[PDB]
Amino acid sequence: SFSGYLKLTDNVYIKNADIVEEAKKVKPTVVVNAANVYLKHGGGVAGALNKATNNAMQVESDDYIATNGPLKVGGSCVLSGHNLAKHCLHVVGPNVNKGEDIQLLKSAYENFNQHEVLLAPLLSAGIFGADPIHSLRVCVDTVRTNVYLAVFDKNLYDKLVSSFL
């Protein structure tokens, strides 16, 4: 199972780790992707997860979009986890760099409640432009299922733990 995680609450855990390396080691039932509405996995967590699948995640995602159209900001879809997990829960957090509504972050975290345990990044953090301290607060106040957060950046991980209320 998951190892080396710091317990924040009854159900939220955090570790300074590369989510791709974490997924390969654990092979969780669900890995969460920080997706956009088009499932275009170009950069950040999405680009890294997709590259680990040798682009199989993008091929599957393009077929999903051709059939279903784009996701909503705050929405999600369950696709294959490929070599990383049983499933990948593609969750769209608001991208504040694309002028999207930050109040949608709670809606985005609500998707995690449909899965008993997940390996996840902080939604809307990184290249999505939101404050990761705010994202962690929304996560612990929204997610009731067991979420193992992988924070890539060591300095951000320390800031998150040392400032956690």
Ligand SMILES: CNC(=O)Cn1cnc2ccccc21
């Ligand atoms: C093998 N893994 C990678 O390519 C590392 N990597 C790149 N962007 C990232 C963003 C978040 C976490 C890990 C990330």
